[PDB]
Amino acid sequence: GSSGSSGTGEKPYKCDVCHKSFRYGSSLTVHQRIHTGEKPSGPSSG
Ligand SMILES: [Zn+2]
Numbered sequence: 001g002s003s004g005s006s007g008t009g010e011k012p013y014k015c016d017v018c019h020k021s022f023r024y025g026s027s028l029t030v031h032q033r034i035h036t037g038e039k040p041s042g043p044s045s046g
Contacts, residue, residue: 018042 011021013028017035022028034041 008023009021011023013022013025014020015022015028015032015035017032017040020028020031022031
């Protein structure tokens with residue numbers, strides 16, 4: 001559960017809404033799918 005990213009962490013493609021890193025650009029977009037269309041998810045603000 002605690003943080004623990006050995007190497008894999010700083011990805012060239014990181015979401016700009018949830019901050020989800022992605023070693024590949026395609027992966028990022030394919031993920032943002034949830035950010036587009038249906039209500040957003042994840043932490044936003046207090
Ligand atoms: Zn995202």
